[PDB]
């Protein structure tokens, strides 16, 4: 830990004569460059040849893994336009790519150091058109993006964040197949633990949606609808108290009748996080006299440590 300049001079001597002056020599050098932080002027604009008009697989895939790590030292108005140019060059290849794997890899390099750079008018429309998708796991953080950019620029998003929520409840009470229900039970579970700031004046979308949709005849429904109840009290406290003399009745089918096996490691966690969050105390605990000893069989039958 005394000569970093020796490694830096060796890197600038070896990589510059390979990159500036075939296939594996690009990857084995760009993975070497993106390993630790440096002090980077001409090496940023060197990427105007690789991921623009390539037809391979591992060129546009590794385009966001290096440039997101080289910009770690992020008032000096010198390289701000360079960061904006890199942020504009990543979106024209993270959206226009046909492969789902590269579109999954362009979201694994986003950090919290770009909150003030995404407030421009030329960068909001890049994520305004990234809502509809056939790939399911890209749309999981699609609500997290508009929830993170909700409180940062609230003066220009107030019609936008209220018109994505009205299309949510239209498919809960009007679904007939298990695929849409299985997708919706995973989609609604992300907003209850990522962005509480769009929930506290918005009781009415999530209040009525978690009443009638708890009586579905596939263990995946029990595993995924209850993920919303798993964080039901973190976003609001002492608000749902006047309507919870019926929620603790249907839980026994999750406990007894061991025929439809569900993930009890998250089910017991869901039934446990509701106590010490919004203040649930003695008032339901006498209405069941029989389930006090069934937990003695729960703690002796299943051998799951979780």
């Amino acid at each position: 830990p005394q000569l970093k300049k020796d490694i830096q001079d060796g890197l600038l001597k070896m990589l510059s004569l390979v990159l500036m002056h075939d296939v594996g020599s690009i990857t084995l050098a760009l993975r070497t460059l993106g390993s630790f932080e440096f002090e980077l002027t001409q090496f940023v604009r060197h990427c105007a040849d690789h991921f623009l008009n390539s037809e391979h697989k591992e060129i546009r895939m590794e385009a966001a893994r290096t440039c997101s790590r080289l910009l770690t030292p992020s008032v000096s108005q010198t390289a701000v336009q360079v960061v904006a140019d890199v942020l504009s060059k990543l979106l024209v290849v993270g959206i226009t790519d046909p492969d789902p794997d590269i579109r999954y890899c362009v979201l694994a390099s986003l950090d919290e150091r770009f909150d003030a750079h995404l407030a421009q008018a030329e960068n909001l429309q890049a994520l305004f058109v990234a809502l509809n998708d056939q790939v399911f796991e890209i749309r999981e953080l699609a609500i997290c993006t508009v929830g993170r950019l909700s409180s940062m620029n609230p003066a220009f998003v107030m019609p936008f964040l209220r018109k994505m929520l009205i299309q949510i409840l239209t498919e809960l009470e009007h679904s007939g197949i298990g695929r849409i229900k299985e997708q919706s039970a995973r989609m609604l579970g992300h907003l209850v633990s990522n962005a509480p700031r769009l929930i506290r004046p918005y009781m009415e979308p999530i209040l009525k949606a978690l009443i009638l949709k708890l009586k579905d005849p596939n263990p995946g429904v029990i595993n995924n609808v209850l993920a919303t109840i798993g964080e039901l009290a973190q976003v609001s406290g002492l608000e749902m108290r006047k309507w919870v003399d019926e929620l603790f009745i249907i839980i026994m089918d999750m406990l007894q009748d061991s025929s439809l096996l569900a993930k009890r490691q998250v089910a017991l966690w869901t039934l446990g996080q509701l106590v010490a969050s919004t203040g649930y105390v003695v008032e339901p605990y006498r209405k069941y006299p029989t389930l006090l000893e069934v937990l003695l069989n729960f703690l002796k039958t299943e051998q799951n440590q979780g």
């Binding site: 509809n132 239209t170 007939g176 849409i180």
Partner: protein
């Protein structure tokens, strides 16, 4: 169905979503040779208009398999490409832009003989987008160069976003 909504007007939103799971089971199985059920259904789809903007995510994603599955016959997929064009002029698709660029690449790779029918599909979409084309400039260099697509109108809408005209 198609005689009800043409005589009442624009008030039929109160009985719409009670028949969407009845339509989800249509595209799953079809024992009829030739698939006349979807052909008779698209004739009622073409008279929707501009009143189905609140239940578009339950009918527009499940109609991708009709022009993608190899089990579909040839006259079945010929009448469903302009069906989106019949409702593109009435509806708005400022947020729906990603699913009409990427699947049509692998759609055109399978059936190149249906170019004269599928050539009008993207036209009504790029007439609706406007200033949402400058991102997808090398996409032509991805697609049309591979497939030798030439038409006199295509040099207009590519140029119109470059010079900055609006019509």
């Amino acid at each position: 169905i198609e005689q009800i909504v043409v005589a009442l007007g624009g008030e039929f939103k109160l009985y719409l979503p009670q028949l969407i799971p009845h339509m989800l089971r249509v595209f799953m199985h079809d024992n009829s040779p030739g698939r006349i059920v979807s052909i008779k259904l698209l004739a009622a789809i073409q008279l929707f208009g501009a009143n189905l903007d609140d239940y578009l995510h339950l009918l527009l994603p499940p109609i991708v398999k009709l022009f993608d599955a190899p089990e579909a016959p040839l006259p079945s997929r010929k009448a469903a490409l302009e069906t989106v064009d019949r409702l593109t002029e009435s509806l708005d698709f400022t947020d729906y832009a990603s699913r009409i660029i990427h699947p049509i690449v692998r759609t055109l790779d399978q059936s190149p003989e249906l170019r004269s029918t599928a050539m009008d599909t993207l036209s009504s979409l790029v007439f609706q987008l406007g200033k949402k084309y400058q991102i997808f400039i090398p996409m032509v260099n991805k697609v049309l160069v591979r497939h030798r697509i030439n038409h006199q109108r295509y040099d207009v809408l590519i140029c119109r976003i470059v010079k900055g005209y609006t019509l």
